[PDB]
Each structure stands twice: as C-alpha cells, then as structure tokens.
C-alpha cells in the first residue's frame, strides 16, 4: 500500500477538493450543529490538511482545536495553513485508534470524510467516545455518494484545442494510477448508507442528520475570483505533484506522455485564468455530504 | 395523459415530499439567494400546492407572492394552506406559457422542480423574463438526480410483520401505476445537468448556483414530533387517495389487493405513530437540490 499523502491524495488535492464542499454562508450553521460554542475545545480525527478543523474555529466563538492525522505531509501543511490564517488550531501526528489524550479532554469530537476510510471504525468511534466529555457531541461528515448526483463536463469554446486531448490523456494516466494504487484499501470503513445506524449502534443518543449540499464550477458567479484563482493554483500543483510521484517510482507512463499531460494541464489552467470573468463552460458537479451527530454517555 | 393532480402527484403527495426538502434553518439563506427583500412581490410558476411559495413569504420581510399552476386541486389546496397560516400569498389557476400579467409586474420570479417538467422550457423562461422587472432575479430549484444519492430501507424490529409484505405489495401496485400513468410525459423539460447552461443560454446574467441538501427519515432527532406526525398523516392520505383514484378507473388491481395494501399502509402508520420517540429503523434517503439564479436585462 502506497503512502496516502503522496500517491493517493496529496495535500494540494485535499485542499482543492475540500475548498468548495461547504458554502461560506453555511459555516455558522455547521458550527452550531457540531456543538461549537464559547469555551469549547474540539478534536478533529483524521483531519488531513485541516480543512474542517479550520472551518470550525474560523468563527467569532472562543474555541480551540486539535487536529490529528497519521500523515506527516498533511500535518505539516495544516500547520502552515493555520499559522498563515492566525487560527487557534494545533496539529498533531498520531493514530485515531490510539488517541494521545486522557479521557474527557474534549467538549466536541468530529471527523470529515473519515469514518468511510478507517479499517476499524468501531475502535475509532470507541476512541472518540473515550476522549469526549460525558454528554458531548460526536459528529461525522461523509459523502452521500462517491459519484456526483449531477454532472456536466461543460462546453468550452471551439478555439480550445486542449479540451479533447486532455480528456483523453487524463483517463489514460488515471487508469494507470488506479492499477499502481488501487482504491479499495482506502474505503474499508462505514458505508455511506450505514452511518446513522452505526451511530445508534455505537450507543450514541439523539442521533441527528443534516445534509450539506455541495457544488463545484468555475463558471459560478457566486464564487469569488480569489477562490477561483486559488483553486486553479491548487489544481495545477495537485496534478503535477501526483504525476511526478508516480514517475519517480515504474507504472507504464512514458516521459513523452508526462510532458504532454503537463503541457495540457498548463493550457487548461491558462485558459481558466484568462477567462476568470467570462467562463461559461459550465463544467460542473454537485451533490451532498451528510452530517451525523450524536451525544455520548 | 392522466390529470396530474389526481393520478401522478396528488396534493398530499406534494406536501409530504416537499416538507423535508429544505431545513427550516436554511429558509433565510434561500430567501436571500432568490432575492427576497422588503417590498418585493414575487411570482412562483408551477407552484403546485405552494410549498416554495409559502417558504419564500414566511419570513419577517415585507413581501407578497402570487403562485400560478394549471391544476385546480393544487390551487385549492394552496389557498387552504396559505389561509390557515395567515400568509401573504395569492394562488391563481393559469398557464406558465401564457402568464395573465403585464410586463415588469414582479421583482422576483421563481419555480420549484418545474423547469424539469415543462414541455417547452424556452417559452416558460421567456414568460418569466417578460413578467420580471428589468434587472430582477429569476430563480429555479431542480433535483440534482431522480435517484437519491444515498439510501437505506431501514431495519425495523423483528416483531413488525407488515414490513416484508408491504415492500412486496408497494412495488407490485406501483409497477401497475407506471403502466397506466407513464412517467416520461412529466419529464420533458431541462435535464438536471443542463439548467445552468440553460440560464446563460436564455440570456440571463451573473448566473449563480447554490446546492440545497435534503434528507428524510422519521428516525432523525433534529425533526420535530409535529413534523413527523404531520408527515405520517400526509403519507397515509396520499397513498390511499392515489390508490382510490386508480380503482375508480381498470388497471389490474383486485379489490382484495387494495384492501391488503390499505391494511398494511395503516399498520406502518400505526407503528410510526407509536414509536414516535424511539424509531431507530433508519429508513432514510438524501441528496441535494440545485438552486440557479440569474439576472434579466
Ligand atoms: N488510523 C488513523 N489515524 C489517524 N489518521 C488516519 C488514520 N487512518 C486514516 N487517517 C487519515 O484520514 C484521512 C481521510 S480523508 C482527509 C480527511 C480530512 N478531514 C479532509 O476532509 O480534508 C487521511 O488524512 C488519512 O491520513
Ligand atoms: N404549462 C403549465 N402552466 C402552469 N403550471 C404547470 C404547467 N405545466 C406543469 N405545471 C405544474 O408544474 C408543477 C410541477 S411539480 C410541483 C411543483 C411545486 N412547485 C412543488 O415543488 O411543490 C405541477 O404542479 C404542474 O401542475
């Protein structure tokens, strides 16, 4: 099995794919539903690059957070991110199955797209229950489906010659990635449909569900330029680093192929940058994540 | 083609299936995104029983609304509903393709799960553009998928003998309904994935997308008893009225079958009522709807 933070999802990939999951305007609601509130200290388990960690501590409330993850690269990045934004969040390398804390340390315990992944969700939940204070809220956000509920590849202007080639190269190189790094190891946890049942089954009380819609497109007028430009940077960087990591291994990608793929990714990004205000391609994707909370005794 | 409000979706069916689409807590956000604001008068096109109409005028803002629909039963019900709740909404029988109003009557024009349905969405949109004031917001909410993104039939206690029989009878009677009333006539409009493209394609500007998550389950601790009890009533009534309408036609349902189906539906409802506080079946379903707005010139 290949190192998660290098070959499967690099730090930039996590940042680019999480950025648009939850509208800015939903943050106070999501904070409230997870039990964020004055003088709350929270733990975010498998925090990756700290996306959800940041979201929860980004309000006006007097809160602090610890994020824990197995991947050194994720923790490094999370620290850099939090430090940059001045946020009260600590990031720590460690194991979900073996939390380096005493019982009843945290008011709130959460995880984001994590219970889906762990080989042993019962034990992880057992840890979350141990470390939360009596009567505190444990929350999980998980994908409702691995497929998007709706999807359009978009229609780019006819001038754009990179569109067909890149589509072709992308699912050629990516099928090669799926060989060398199979997905089935990463999705050993609680099935999407089973999470609510899992919560009451682990003894949690007042089990509550809240859907959280998600949408992606650079054509969206309600998304800031800054966010679009930040996404484009992260997309470029995430694709190039993933490719390079696989080259430095061999998996069946010629150097000509790689330079082609680089060139095309570069052309897409250049087009997206140049058409920041008038991108009407509607390459778009949506669906919903599911928030589940329960109280521990 | 069978009368929509009788054979396809009766007023109670619309109320039961819309009730849980949008969390109460999202109402101010959804109002804002559609351009609801003081001294706004709005039109809701194909308003059905007036679900979305009610949602938009239910805030503190000084707003009023007209709902328009082809179905007399929907309009009747909408009136009864609005009158009961004291809401500033008028409901009118009429045609989306032929709006009984002058140009520039409304500040805002909206529709909910409608652009998906109309045989001629271009003309409907043309009407919406005509009737909205210059620079006003046209909005549409549509399903992201006809399937739910996630799903669990649930695990009812072993004592419940109605569970297996009803599953069996439901998709037996319903396959008979799909024969006598085929679905394909009702879904002649804009494909889910095409709505954003449709908006810019119809000349609308600053086209904006907002996902709206949805979830259903009577096991949810965050849903009020009152809402659960109201859902159960509507479910009972919607199923019985649909069945009766089809009996009064012949479609291949014996009277024994009907009385069986009645009995079972009744037993499910009795169980749901009796287990209002301790339903841990997790019969649940979720996904997201998509809100699209654009400005008219
Ligand atoms: N046993 C374990 N202990 C700690 N972290 C783990 C773990 N197993 C998996 N992880 C981490 O779980 C994460 C799943 S996905 C990334 C999750 C992050 N919350 C986000 O949405 O951005 C990965 O970061 C992975 O490194
Ligand atoms: N040409 C037309 N003019 C007016 N209403 C129409 C129409 N074609 C379809 N409708 C109505 O469009 C609706 C679609 S579904 C019900 C929509 C309602 N907004 C809700 O979500 O509860 C039906 O009520 C149907 O009667």
3-state SS record for chain B: CCCHHHHHCCHHHHHHHHCCCCCHHHHHHHHHHCCCCCCEEEEEECCCCCHHHHHHHCCCCCEEEEEEECCHHHHHHHHHHHHHHCCCEEEEECCCCCCCCCCCCEEEEEEECCCCCCCCHHHHHHHHHHHEEEEEEEEEEEECCCCCCEEECCCCCCCCCHHHHHHHHHHHHHHHHHHHCCHHHCCCCCCHHHHHHHHHHCCCEEEEEEEEEEEECCCCCCCCHHHHHHHHHHHHHHHHHHHHHHHCCCCCCCHHHHHHHHHHHHHHHHHHHHCCCCCCCCCEEEEEEEEEEEECC
- Structure tokens, B199: 């908006």
Cα–Cα distances in Å, from B6 out to B45, B181, B232, B244, B249?
Answer: 19, 11, 20, 10, 12
Q: Given ligand 2 and candidates B11, B48, B78, which is best to mutate, with the most ligand atoms within 8 Å of its CB?
A: B48
- What is the spatial distance between Cα A213 and Cα A215, in angstroms, rounded to a whole number? 7
- What is the spatial distance between Cα A105 and Cα A109, in angstroms, rounded to a whole number? 10
Residue with tokens 């907002």: B210
The overall longest dimension of chain B from CA atoms, in Å, is 62
3-state secondary structure of A125: helix
Please list, in sequence order, all residues whose beta carbon lies within 8 angstroms of the beta carbon of residue A221, skipping any fewer than 6 positions away.
B206, B207, B208
Gaps after residue numbers in chain B (C–N over 2.5 angstroms): 249
Beta strands in chain A (DSSP E): 40-45, 63-69, 89-93, 106-112, 132-143, 150-152, 205-216, 284-295
Q: Determine, for residues A149 and B288 on separate chains, whether the beta-carbon distance falls below 8 Å.
A: yes
- What is the spatial distance between Cα A18 and Cα A26, in angstroms, rounded to a whole number? 14
Cα–chain center distance at A96:
17
CA atoms in the 13 A half-sphere facing the CB of A78: 30
Contact between residue B197 and residue A155 where contact means Cβ atoms under 8 Å apart:
yes
- What is the spatial distance between Cα A22 and Cα A215, in angstroms, rounded to a whole number? 8
- Structure tokens, B166: 């009803």
Sign, Cα dihedral of A12, A148, A172, A220: negative
- What is the spatial distance between Cα A3 and Cα A49, in angstroms, rounded to a whole number? 15
Q: Which of A54, A71, A55 is closest to A9 using CA atoms? A: A71
Q: Which of B143, B97, B26, B102 is closest to A150 using CA atoms? A: B143
- What is the spatial distance between Cα B194 and Cα B207, in angstroms, rounded to a whole number? 13
Angle made by CA atoms A93, A289, A30, in degrees to the nearest 5: 75
Contact between residue B294 and residue B204 where contact means Cβ atoms under 8 Å apart:
yes
Please list, in sequence order, all residues whose beta carbon lies within 8 angstroms of the beta carbon of residue B74, skipping any fewer than 6 positions away.
B5, B11, B14, B47, B48, B49, B50
- What is the spatial distance between Cα A117 and Cα A46, in angstroms, rounded to a whole number? 9
Contact between residue A170 and residue A283 where contact means Cβ atoms under 8 Å apart:
no
Output the CA B104–ligand 2 centroid distance in Å.
Answer: 22
Cα–chain center distance at B167:
24
User: Nearest CA to CA, how far is A192 from chain B (Å)?
Assistant: 7
- Structure tokens, B173: 């009677």
Tell whether B27 is within 8 A of chain A (Cβ): no
Residue with tokens 């800031």: A224
- Structure tokens, A179: 């060989």
Q: Which of A71, A136, A70, A127 is closest to A102 using CA atoms? A: A127
The b/e string for A244-278 (b: 16+ C-beta within 10 A; e otherwise) is ebbeeeeeebeeebbebbbebbebbbebbeebeee
What's the burial of B266, exposed, middle or buried (CB within 10 Å: 0-12/13-18/19+)?
middle
Contact between residue A290 and residue A195 where contact means Cβ atoms under 8 Å apart:
yes
- What is the spatial distance between Cα A128 and Cα A98, in angstroms, rounded to a whole number? 10
- What is the spatial distance between Cα B251 and Cα B243, in angstroms, rounded to a whole number? 11
Q: Which of B36, B71, B68 is closest to B55 using CA atoms? A: B36
Output the CA B48–ligand 2 centroid distance in Å.
Answer: 5
Contact between residue A291 and residue A182 where contact means Cβ atoms under 8 Å apart:
no
CB-defined site of ligand 1, < 6 Å = A 4, 14, 18, 46-49, 51-52, 69-71, 74, 95-97, 112-114, 117-118
Ligand 2 nearest-atom number relative to CA B95: 3
Q: Which of residues 124-153 of B touch A (CB under 8 A)?
A: 144-145, 149-152
Contact between residue B27 and residue B288 where contact means Cβ atoms under 8 Å apart:
no
- Structure tokens, B43: 């039109």
Find out whether B96 is annotated in a ligand binding site: yes
- The residues facing B137 across adjacent strands are B108, B295
Helix extents (H) in A132-254: 162-180, 195-201, 225-247
Contact between residue B45 and residue B128 where contact means Cβ atoms under 8 Å apart:
yes
Q: Which of A135, A128, A110, A105 is closest to A205 using CA atoms? A: A135
Residue with tokens 């008219």: B296
DSSP-derived letter for residue A46 is T
Cα–Cα distances in Å, from B72 out to A106, B77, B79?
Answer: 57, 9, 11
Angle made by CA atoms A43, A44, A45, in degrees to the nearest 5: 110
- What is the spatial distance between Cα A12 and Cα A233, in angstroms, rounded to a whole number? 9
Phi/psi at B40 (nearest 5 deg)? -105, 135
Output the CA A209–ligand 1 centroid distance in Å.
Answer: 22
Q: Determine, for residues A210 and B23 on separate chains, whether the beta-carbon distance falls below 8 Å.
A: yes
Sign, Cα dihedral of B43, B44, B45, B48: negative
What's the burial of A110, exposed, middle or buried (CB within 10 Å: 0-12/13-18/19+)?
buried
Q: Which of A105, A131, A132 is closest to A35 using CA atoms? A: A132
Cα–Cα distances in Å, from A275 out to A223, B75, B168?
Answer: 14, 46, 54
Q: In chain A, what is the straight-line distance between the N-terminal and C-terminal CA atoms, in Å? A: 37
User: Nearest CA to CA, how far is B40 from chain A (Å)?
Assistant: 22
User: Nearest CA to CA, how far is A124 from chain B (Å)?
Assistant: 22
Gaps after residue numbers in chain A (C–N over 2.5 angstroms): 249
Strand B63-69 vs strand B89-93: parallel, antiparallel, or unpaired?
A: parallel
Question: What kind of experiment solved this structure?
Answer: X-ray
- What is the spatial distance between Cα A228 and Cα A33, in angstroms, rounded to a whole number? 28
CA atoms in the 13 A half-sphere facing the CB of A108: 26
Please list, in sequence order, all residues whose beta carbon lies within 8 angstroms of the beta carbon of residue B199, skipping any fewer than 6 positions away.
B138, B140, B207, B292, B294
Contact between residue A100 and residue A43 where contact means Cβ atoms under 8 Å apart:
no
- Structure tokens, B3: 């009368």
Resolution (A): 2.0
């Amino acid at each position: 099995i290949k190192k998660w933070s290098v070959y499967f999802q690099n730090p930039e990939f996590l940042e680019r794919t999480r950025m648009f999951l939850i509208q800015k305007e939903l943050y106070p609601l999501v904070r409230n539903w997870c039990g964020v509130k004055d003088n709350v200290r929270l733990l975010d388990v498998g925090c990756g690059t700290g996306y959800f960690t940041r979201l929860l501590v980004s309000g006006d409330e007097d809160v602090s957070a610890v994020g824990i993850d197995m991947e050194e690269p994720f923790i490094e990045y999370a620290r850099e991110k939090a430090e940059e934004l001045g946020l009260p969040a600590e990031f720590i390398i460690g194991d979900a199955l073996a939390l380096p804390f005493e019982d009843n340390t945290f008011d709130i315990v959460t995880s984001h797209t994590f219970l889906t992944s762990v080989p042993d969700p019962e034990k992880a939940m057992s840890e979350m229950k141990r470390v939360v204070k009596p009567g505190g809220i444990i929350s999980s956000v998980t994908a409702m489906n691995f497929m998007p509920a709706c999807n359009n590849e978009g229609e780019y202007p006819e001038e754009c010659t990179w569109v067909e080639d890149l589509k072709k190269e992308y699912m050629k190189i990516y099928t090669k990635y799926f060989s060398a790094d199979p997905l089935e190891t990463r999705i050993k946890g609680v099935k999407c449909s089973d999470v609510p049942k899992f919560f009451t089954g682990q003894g949690l009380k007042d089990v509550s569900l809240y859907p959280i819609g998600k949408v992606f497109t650079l054509s969206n007028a309600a998304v800031s330029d800054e966010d679009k430009l930040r996404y484009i940077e992260l997309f470029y960087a995430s694709e190039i680093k993933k490719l390079d990591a696989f080259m430095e291994l061999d998996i069946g990608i010629t150097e000509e192929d790689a330079e082609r793929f680089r060139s095309l990714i570069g052309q897409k990004c250049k087009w997206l940058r140049d058409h920041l205000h008038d991108n009407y391609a509607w390459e778009w994707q949506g669906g919903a994540n599911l928030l589940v909370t329960g109280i521990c005794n």
